[PDB]
RNA sequence: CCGAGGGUAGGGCCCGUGACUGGGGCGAAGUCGUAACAAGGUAGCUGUACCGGAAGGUGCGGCUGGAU
RNA sequence: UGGGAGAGGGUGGUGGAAUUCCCGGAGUAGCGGUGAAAUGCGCAGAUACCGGGAGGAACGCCGAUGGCGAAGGCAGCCAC
RNA sequence: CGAUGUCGGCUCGUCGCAUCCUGGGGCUGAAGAAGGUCCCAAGGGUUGGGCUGUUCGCCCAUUAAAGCGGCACGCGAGCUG
RNA sequence: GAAUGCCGGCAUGAGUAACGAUAAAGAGGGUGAGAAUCCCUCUCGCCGUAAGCCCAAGGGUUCCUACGCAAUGGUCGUCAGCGUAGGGUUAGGCGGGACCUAAGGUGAAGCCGAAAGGCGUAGCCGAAGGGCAGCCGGUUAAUAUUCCGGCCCUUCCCGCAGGUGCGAUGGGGGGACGCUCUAGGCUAGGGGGACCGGAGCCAUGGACGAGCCCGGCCAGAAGCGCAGGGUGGGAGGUAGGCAAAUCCGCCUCCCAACAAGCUCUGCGUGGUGGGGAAGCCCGGGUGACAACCCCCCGAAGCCAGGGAGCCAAGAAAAGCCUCUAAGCACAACCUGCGGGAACCCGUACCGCAAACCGACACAGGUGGGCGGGUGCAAGAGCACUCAGGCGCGCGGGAGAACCCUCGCCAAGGAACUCUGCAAGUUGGCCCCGUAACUUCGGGAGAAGGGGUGCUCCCUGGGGUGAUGAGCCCCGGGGAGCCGCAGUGAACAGGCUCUGGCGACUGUUUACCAAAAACACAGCUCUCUGCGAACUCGUAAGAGGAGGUAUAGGGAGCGACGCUUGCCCGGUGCCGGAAGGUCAAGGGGAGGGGUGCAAGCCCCGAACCGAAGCCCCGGUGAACGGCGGCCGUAACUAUAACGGUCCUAAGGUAGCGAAAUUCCUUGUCGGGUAAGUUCCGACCUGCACGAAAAGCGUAACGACCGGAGCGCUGUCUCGGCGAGGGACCCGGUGAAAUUGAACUGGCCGUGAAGAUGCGGCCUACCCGUGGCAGGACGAAAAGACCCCGUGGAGCUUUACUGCAGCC
RNA sequence: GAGCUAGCCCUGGCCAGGGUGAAGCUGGGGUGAGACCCAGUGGAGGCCCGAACCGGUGGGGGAUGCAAACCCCUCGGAUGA
RNA sequence: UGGUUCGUGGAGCCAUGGGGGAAUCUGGGCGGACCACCGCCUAAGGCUAAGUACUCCGGGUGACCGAUAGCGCACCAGUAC
């Protein structure tokens, strides 16, 4: 769990990598991948709309099953656990007794060779998927649909988890990975357990070059630019911001709430986020 | 040192060529003007 | 060949000494407070941590070498 | 070999009292605090009372001058 | 101001004299030696170094002496930067 | 007659600079009206990981031959990439199309936009990626995997034979993949041979020799051999692969699992077809019936989709195999054989350059492959050389100053200078040895030394082969020889001590700045619950992301260590269903106009009425800020201490004459003979200070300070020598500039610095090589500075609007 | 107008040779078992030296240039951002 | 909000982006806010020659040019570059 290195180079001093101990298959399923078109941050106009993207490692997309309710009552064996470069979680390859194969994001505690199943009847065991209304209150859970049949949306990053606090009406109350308390419909599926690879957050990139491999190009401070470029531009020598800290587009970036006031979801959010 | 003109037959006909001018209103006005001035060639030569 | 020693370079140990700096001891009648000895007027002491002109204070845990 | 007491250790679970916050109700002119006050909180509806919800910590009675451990130390209850 | 390149250093001089040294003098509170002060004198001479961009100055070791000033603060179609 | 006017023409500078790498030339013969320059020969020199040879791009006849020399060629020209004419590029297999998909572009359906237009799944287009059949030699003045020779191969059509449930733009398999390291066996390529073949050679003192010199191959179907790649076989069930399916997928059972078998490539052999040198003759003949063998080195290439380890987790689609649906099983497909058919476009030539990009026959720039040998530890490094290619399209003399590039130097050795700038020194390999400090990796090639050639003798292990000889790679030991000197030549660190800044490798002002600046791992704040926030767009649509709070955006700080204090009064942001103010709208007290009148029309107070602002709170790794004056101790001095005024609060730790200190070279210490710099200290900090972070910090740095050693032409202080220029002769022949010129010194005068005025002095006429004081010398209508009710970038609590948001 | 230049997207290619010797594995020691130690093996890395290639540090030359950014000597990176 | 001479003006008229929303002659618009009288005209469908504009083209004519003029072009010019 997080391997360090000897300081035999200045960058190896602090660079740490994952242990990869839970991986059991080093190549993807040839029928479950398709090429992932790198955007480099540029949109259909050819315009940079997200800055500092691009130049990272070539990748293939693993088609993940964020529905699960496709195959109610059809068990599947956990055949392997693999690396996916498109998310922080690991992925679990499932051989359905159908002969169908699919990926799910691999929760913590999963083990190759066990069995998983989805549906109202499913037992409350790591890997099983159920509509939220059938899962006991207080269960930790991931891959939650935000609306019935729309796809697992919440709790998908490595180590994240959501907890069913209680129920009212057709809706159940979850505490999200951000500490938010939110109502989600009871028909919404979810999978029990937390997402695996929790040590993902203790990784130290270690050098500039590791951000580049991930496609993260260098971020330039507004204070290093000129008035034409950014509200923090200019100054003779260094300069404090000398005005409320703004983004490149001039909106304040220190506390200014940006969520839309009249949003229809506000009726389903019980309490804003945590720390 | 390396200079600005680096000829490329494929780049030429795809940027200034006849079929490129006909795809936009601005390119068509070029040819309209260029015809109206009696220019002997509407479009740069490139040997395909 | 060896060789007293001379020469070159680099280490180790000890002694003297140094602008200045740190506390220590001692010094009949200096300044500031009053922490301990009575429950010493907030019981004291304690390891540690933080803080404060100073003795000290305070938090956590501990001891009775604590009075009623 | 056959037995016996015990807060001895570790892991995993789990119960109620109470404090705090938030929601709702009902209700009004102060609450809180000290040696005495004041800061503070309260008509933007506090305190006191009821209902619900969220969370963390410590285990009241039994508890004793008691028991266990090499010492430090170990106290709700359940299982290994 | 349709441009007179601006500090200092180097190189290369040349001039003035209110003379730093050498030469000639008077006065001296000039015994001697060595000084003080003024007069005459521009022929020649007027060192090497440490610090600083420095001019200047301070210091070290000497010296007969280690002079002051001018020449677009002499000298960038001569160099340095 | 002037506009630094416009256009043209012609002068000055001037027979001046220059003639484009310092790789280099000389002679003989020839051609021609004419020759340093063209052709031929010999001699010399230069490149040889190229300055040699293939390929691609770009260029577009420049290629070959004949005849020419006006211009082009920096001179010449008889020559040429020039002029005229004639000739030259040949493919089922090479490259591209009639095949595939990539980003991207386009775009049925569909969406959007005043118009023009913008998007957009499928589809289609799009290549140097995938896929797909030719190798050797010969021939031409000029093309050749293209013509010809030999030996091979593919696809389409039709036929015959045999086989089979045939059949597709649909299902499935496959195609199908990274980086680093790398095994086995081969080939490419190279080295040696006492062997095989070869025209000759014996010089000049010796050698007739195991002598010298030249050469000892290439391609090749099936089969076979060696080395490798891919690959389980059978049955039962099936609900999944958007219909079907015997294929695939999943489960169960049997058999076989480092194999074998089957299959596909590489290499070898292989019927057969080729090639074949020095030398000597005149590109050709001969050599020649040429020989065509053994040994060794050996890839980065091949077998290959090989293996291992690793994290950053490494295209698609067709060809192809298989599965079946309609349909059809007189068909259709598969296999083999045979004949027939096989289209379009490119192909010349230059191609690190005189033919491409740079206005030039321009010292610049331009992607891929091959790139020999010997020695130096390796190598594509360095030196020399093969093959092949050149001597750079002005030359001949001379032997000045001065310039560039280069060599050396007595004694001294940084005294030079802003600075050791520059140049010395050091220099590879092997062995010995190697400090503070440290994050234990390092600092480290620290430092400092010793060795290095050749001959003879003995000796150890390795690859090949076989276990031996031979060949080849690594050594150990002993005795000697020579020189000033043995990495004898070329290529190849000077070192240390101590400060500042920045952790680090990186990045940057193309073309005056490479840095301390930017970035950077890491830290904190804050926003965002997904049709996310945010960003681009009028929009649709996109990016964010086929991601989901261990995620994503924004901001500051900048590895790491130890830390980051107090102030929320003002601005910002966060919260606050009360209160105040609040526009449209609601309301309608009450007036007004007009009409004979019902009516029509106008204005209008209270009162309700959003966000915003006001108001009450919170909030600093949010904008920011963090006092003054007076007094006090048993010597003096200084104040732990007290007084009072003010503030929102009064700068904590740490550091300090500092990249910050004005006074200032502060003061004291160190270093020095001497230290405005440097280091260490003190603290009256003009005017440090804690994420515009504070203080340290091993390692790192073409950064910037200070010092020492070494060593030097930097210097005292210069001298000599080399080449390339300058100089002279022959050839060609510019430039800016230029009112006109018959254009001297001084002292004056003058718009205040006079060749040109006054007075005096000096001076025969004209040049060449030189130096730069003047012609307020040339160049650029001064960038500084001011002015203009000139302009542009940028800012904000300047004004007024706009997008955006509420 | 992105045939220059800046960034990104798709698909290809390139980086002689030498040095250092991480994790891992193996063996030995050690212990109750361990950690840990030693040796061999291995071949990591914005590691080290140095061509090609990419740069442009310092000086000199050039300055109507060979060149509207060049030449020479010196120097940086050279498996990687 | 646009048009008109009309820039919010006492601002009608014409047109229309939004909200409300009739009537068929005893219906409706206008005569510069509005009201009355007096008058003018019949919206929410369409077409319609001529008289007006211009000169790529062809003629005729100049107190128009005469090769630096007149078109950029008298000529192989939108060419060479
Ligand atoms: C590299 C070569 C060029 O020269 C220069 O760059 C040198 C460094 C210059 O300084 C030049 C001479 C500039 O001239 C100076 O400009 C100053 C503001 C004013 C000076 N003047 C006495 C006051 C004046 O001499 C320049 C404005 C004039 C140029 C355009 C010029 O005419 C020639 C330029 C060169 C020769 O190409
Ligand atoms: K100025
Ligand atoms: Mg590490
Ligand atoms: Mg390691
Ligand atoms: Mg894992
Ligand atoms: Mg794949
Ligand atoms: Mg696929
Ligand atoms: Mg981007
Ligand atoms: Mg696009
Ligand atoms: Mg586009
Ligand atoms: Mg962005
Ligand atoms: Mg993963
Ligand atoms: Mg829901
Ligand atoms: Mg990546
Ligand atoms: Mg940054
Ligand atoms: Mg800046
Ligand atoms: Mg801009
Ligand atoms: Mg701005
Ligand atoms: Mg600013
Ligand atoms: Mg800036
Ligand atoms: Mg700035
Ligand atoms: Mg500043
Ligand atoms: Mg700045
Ligand atoms: Mg700031
Ligand atoms: Mg400010
Ligand atoms: Mg701002
Ligand atoms: Mg916003
Ligand atoms: Mg929230
Ligand atoms: Mg180009
Ligand atoms: Mg092309
Ligand atoms: Mg092309
Ligand atoms: Mg192109
Ligand atoms: Mg083109
Ligand atoms: Mg024509
Ligand atoms: Mg055109
Ligand atoms: Mg002696
Ligand atoms: Mg006390
Ligand atoms: Mg006391
Ligand atoms: Mg007490
Ligand atoms: Mg006591
Ligand atoms: Mg105090
Ligand atoms: Mg306290
Ligand atoms: Mg206590
Ligand atoms: Mg007591
Ligand atoms: Mg009220
Ligand atoms: Mg002036
Ligand atoms: Mg002038
Ligand atoms: Mg001038
Ligand atoms: Mg001038
Ligand atoms: Mg005298
Ligand atoms: Mg006298
Ligand atoms: Mg006397
Ligand atoms: Mg004199
Ligand atoms: Mg001085
Ligand atoms: Mg001066
Ligand atoms: Mg001074
Ligand atoms: Mg004297
Ligand atoms: Mg003066
Ligand atoms: Mg001067
Ligand atoms: Mg001068
Ligand atoms: Mg100059
Ligand atoms: Mg000067
Ligand atoms: Mg001059
Ligand atoms: Mg001069
Ligand atoms: Mg300077
Ligand atoms: Mg006139
Ligand atoms: Mg002129
Ligand atoms: Mg003019
Ligand atoms: Mg003119
Ligand atoms: Mg002219
Ligand atoms: Mg003349
Ligand atoms: Mg002339
Ligand atoms: Mg002339
Ligand atoms: Mg002339
Ligand atoms: Mg002359
Ligand atoms: Mg010239
Ligand atoms: Mg020249
Ligand atoms: Mg000769
Ligand atoms: Mg002739
Ligand atoms: Mg000739
Ligand atoms: Mg001739
Ligand atoms: Mg060679
Ligand atoms: Mg051309
Ligand atoms: Mg040819
Ligand atoms: Mg002729
Ligand atoms: Mg000619
Ligand atoms: Mg001629
Ligand atoms: Mg002639
Ligand atoms: Mg000519
Ligand atoms: Mg000629
Ligand atoms: Mg020429
Ligand atoms: Mg030809
Ligand atoms: Mg042809
Ligand atoms: Mg053929
Ligand atoms: Mg070809
Ligand atoms: Mg066809
Ligand atoms: Mg296609
Ligand atoms: Mg389109
Ligand atoms: Mg296309
Ligand atoms: Mg292709
Ligand atoms: Mg062949
Ligand atoms: Mg012929
Ligand atoms: Mg068959
Ligand atoms: Mg079939
Ligand atoms: Mg098929
Ligand atoms: Mg590929
Ligand atoms: Mg890797
Ligand atoms: Mg071969
Ligand atoms: Mg060899
Ligand atoms: Mg010979
Ligand atoms: Mg195999
Ligand atoms: Mg022959
Ligand atoms: Mg014969
Ligand atoms: Mg493999
Ligand atoms: Mg595709
Ligand atoms: Mg039939
Ligand atoms: Mg055809
Ligand atoms: Mg053709
Ligand atoms: Mg050809
Ligand atoms: Mg040529
Ligand atoms: Mg060629
Ligand atoms: Mg080149
Ligand atoms: Mg090439
Ligand atoms: Mg030439
Ligand atoms: Mg050239
Ligand atoms: Mg070669
Ligand atoms: Mg070597
Ligand atoms: Mg050359
Ligand atoms: Mg030449
Ligand atoms: Mg000459
Ligand atoms: Mg001469
Ligand atoms: Mg000599
Ligand atoms: Mg000599
Ligand atoms: Mg010497
Ligand atoms: Mg010395
Ligand atoms: Mg010395
Ligand atoms: Mg110097
Ligand atoms: Mg200095
Ligand atoms: Mg220095
Ligand atoms: Mg040297
Ligand atoms: Mg050397
Ligand atoms: Mg160490
Ligand atoms: Mg050494
Ligand atoms: Mg040595
Ligand atoms: Mg010898
Ligand atoms: Mg063997
Ligand atoms: Mg020697
Ligand atoms: Mg070296
Ligand atoms: Mg300093
Ligand atoms: Mg740096
Ligand atoms: Mg640091
Ligand atoms: Mg740092
Ligand atoms: Mg850094
Ligand atoms: Mg620059
Ligand atoms: Mg610039
Ligand atoms: Mg430039
Ligand atoms: Mg420069
Ligand atoms: Mg700079
Ligand atoms: Mg640099
Ligand atoms: Mg920068
Ligand atoms: Mg930090
Ligand atoms: Mg926008
Ligand atoms: Mg999206
Ligand atoms: Mg997407
Ligand atoms: Mg930075
Ligand atoms: Mg910073
Ligand atoms: Mg430390
Ligand atoms: Mg505040
Ligand atoms: Mg505030
Ligand atoms: Mg407040
Ligand atoms: Mg309204
Ligand atoms: Mg009336
Ligand atoms: Mg309001
Ligand atoms: Mg403030
Ligand atoms: Mg302060
Ligand atoms: Mg404080
Ligand atoms: Mg503190
Ligand atoms: Mg100080
Ligand atoms: Mg300061
Ligand atoms: Mg100072
Ligand atoms: Mg100062
Ligand atoms: Mg001083
Ligand atoms: Mg001293
Ligand atoms: Mg200091
Ligand atoms: Mg002081
Ligand atoms: Mg500061
Ligand atoms: Mg700040
Ligand atoms: Mg600052
Ligand atoms: Mg510091
Ligand atoms: Mg440090
Ligand atoms: Mg340290
Ligand atoms: Mg650096
Ligand atoms: Mg640097
Ligand atoms: Mg010299
Ligand atoms: Mg010479
Ligand atoms: Mg000529
Ligand atoms: Mg005249
Ligand atoms: Mg005259
Ligand atoms: Mg005057
Ligand atoms: Mg005068
Ligand atoms: Mg005169
Ligand atoms: Mg006159
Ligand atoms: Mg007169
Ligand atoms: Mg006169
Ligand atoms: Mg005279
Ligand atoms: Mg002459
Ligand atoms: Mg002359
Ligand atoms: Mg002159
Ligand atoms: Mg002058
Ligand atoms: Mg002008
Ligand atoms: Mg002017
Ligand atoms: Mg100007
Ligand atoms: Mg300027
Ligand atoms: Mg002014
Ligand atoms: Mg004004
Ligand atoms: Mg004015
Ligand atoms: Mg203005
Ligand atoms: Mg402006
Ligand atoms: Mg580009
Ligand atoms: Mg391009
Ligand atoms: Mg490389
Ligand atoms: Mg090793
Ligand atoms: Mg490296
Ligand atoms: Mg350079
Ligand atoms: Mg460059
Ligand atoms: Mg140098
Ligand atoms: Mg220049
Ligand atoms: Mg160069
Ligand atoms: Mg060089
Ligand atoms: Mg290197
Ligand atoms: Mg390398
Ligand atoms: Mg008005
Ligand atoms: Mg109006
Ligand atoms: Mg109106
Ligand atoms: Mg009717
Ligand atoms: Mg009527
Ligand atoms: Mg009516
Ligand atoms: Mg109307
Ligand atoms: Mg009306
Ligand atoms: Mg009317
Ligand atoms: Mg009226
Ligand atoms: Mg009318
Ligand atoms: Mg009508
Ligand atoms: Mg008409
Ligand atoms: Mg008409
Ligand atoms: Mg006519
Ligand atoms: Mg006429
Ligand atoms: Mg004419
Ligand atoms: Mg005319
Ligand atoms: Mg015309
Ligand atoms: Mg003309
Ligand atoms: Mg043209
Ligand atoms: Mg022409």
Three-state SS string across chain A, please?
CCECCCCCCCCCCCCCECCCCCCCECCCCHHHEEECCCCCCECCCCCECCCCECCCCCCEEECECCCCHHHCCCCEEEEEEECCCCCCCCEEEEEECCCCEEEEECECCCCCCCEECECCCCCCCCCCEEEHHHCCCCCEEECEECCCCCCEEECCCCCCCEEEEEEECCEEEEECCCCCEEEEECCCEEEECCECCHHHHHCCCCCHHHHHHCCECCCCCHHHCCCCCCCCCCCCCCCCCCCCCECCCCCECCCCCCCCCCCHHHHHEEECCCC
- The CA–C1' separation of B41 and F651, in angstroms, is 79
Chain G: nucleotides under 7 Å from a protein CB?
1-5, 7-11, 22-23, 44-47, 69-70, 80-81
HSE-up of A164 (CA within 13 Å, CB side)?
29
Chain H: nucleotides under 7 Å from a protein CB?
72, 77-80
How far is it, in rounded angstroms, from Cα B21 to Cα B31? 7
Question: Which nucleotide is at minimal CA–C1' distance from A163?
Answer: D54
Distance A275 CA to ligand 203 centre (A): 100
A83's CB contacts (< 8 A; 6+ apart) are: A20, A23, A26, A90, A91
Q: Are A166 and A172 in contact (CB under 8 A)?
A: yes
Q: Are A68 and A116 in contact (CB under 8 A)?
A: no
Three-state DSSP at B17 gives coil
Phi, psi values for residue B26, rounded to 5°: -65, -40
Helix, strand and coil content of chain B, in percent to the nearest 5, comes to: 50, 0, 50
Query: What are the tokens at A231?
Result: 């509200």
Chain F: nucleotides under 7 Å from a protein CB?
57-60, 103-105, 116-120, 172-176, 238-241, 249-251, 310-316, 356-358, 364-366, 439-441, 503-505, 511, 517-522, 525-537, 541-560, 572-575, 618, 622-624, 692-693, 698-699, 793-797, 805-806
Phi, psi values for residue A49, rounded to 5°: -120, -10
Strand partners, A124: none
Residue positions counted in chain A: 275
How far is it, in rounded angstroms, from Cα A40 to Cα A248? 20
How far is it, in rounded angstroms, from Cα A173 to Cα A269? 9
How far is it, in rounded angstroms, from Cα A177 to Cα A154? 8
How far is it, in rounded angstroms, from Cα A39 to Cα A196? 28
A94's CB contacts (< 8 A; 6+ apart) are: A65, A76, A77, A78, A79, A101, A102, A103, A104, A116
Distance B39 CA to ligand 70 centre (A): 30
To one decimal, the resolution in angstroms is 2.6
């Amino acid at each position: 769990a997080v391997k360090k290195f000897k300081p035999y180079t200045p960058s190896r001093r602090f660079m740490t990598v994952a242990d990869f101990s839970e991986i059991t298959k080093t190549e993807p399923e040839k029928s479950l991948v398709k090429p992932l078109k790198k955007t480099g941050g540029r949109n259909n106009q050819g315009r940079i709309t997200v800055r500092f993207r691009g130049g990272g490692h070539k990748r293939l997309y693993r088609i993940i099953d964020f529905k699960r309710w496709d195959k109610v009552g059809i068990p599947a064996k956990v055949a392997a656990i693999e690396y996916d470069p498109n998310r922080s979680a690991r992925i679990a390859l499932l051989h359905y007794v159908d002969g169908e194969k699919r990926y799910i994001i691999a929760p913590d505690g999963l083990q190759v060779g066990q069995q998983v199943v989805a549906g109202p009847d499913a037992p409350i065991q790591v890997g099983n998927a159920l509509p939220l209304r059938f899962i006991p209150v207080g269960t930790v859970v991931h891959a939650v649909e935000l609306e019935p049949k729309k796809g697992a949306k919440l709790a998908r990053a490595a180590g994240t988890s959501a907890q069913i606090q209680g129920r009212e009406g057709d809706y159940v109350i979850l505490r999200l990975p951000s500490g938010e308390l939110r109502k989600v419909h009871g028909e919404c599926y979810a999978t029990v357990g937390a997402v695996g690879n929790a040590d993902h957050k203790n990784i130290v990139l270690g050098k500039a070059g590791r951000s580049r491999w991930l496609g993260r190009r260098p971020h330039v401070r507004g204070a290093a630019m000129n008035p034409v470029d950014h509200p923090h531009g200019g100054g003779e020598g260094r300069a404090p911001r000398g005005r409320p800290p703004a983004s490149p587009w001039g909106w304040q970036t220190k506390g200014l709430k940006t969520r839309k006031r009249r949003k229809p979801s506000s009726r389903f959010i019980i309490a804003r986020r945590k720390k | 040192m390396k200079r600005t003109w680096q000829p490329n037959r494929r780049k030429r006909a795809k940027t200034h060529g006849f079929r490129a001018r006909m795809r936009t209103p601005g390119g068509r006005k070029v040819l309209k003007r260029r015809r109206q001035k009696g220019r002997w060639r509407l479009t740069p030569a490139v040997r395909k």
